Design a protein around this ligand. Sequence first.
Ligand SMILES: [Zn+2]
Length: 60
Amino acid sequence: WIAANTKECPKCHVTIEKDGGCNHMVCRNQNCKAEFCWVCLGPWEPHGSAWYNCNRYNEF
Ligand SMILES: [Zn+2]
């Protein structure tokens, strides 16, 4: 049961199609410079059940 979806940053509200300027991590570019939700932040990939990376949440 993986609840996720594709969308723009919530705390930043800056839609991005191609990964440009923001590396896959805690989005901290411009509007995102302040806060981001977790590392993944509800991506779609995790929906594959660890098919690509693993899930929408990594340990510490
Ligand atoms: Zn962001």
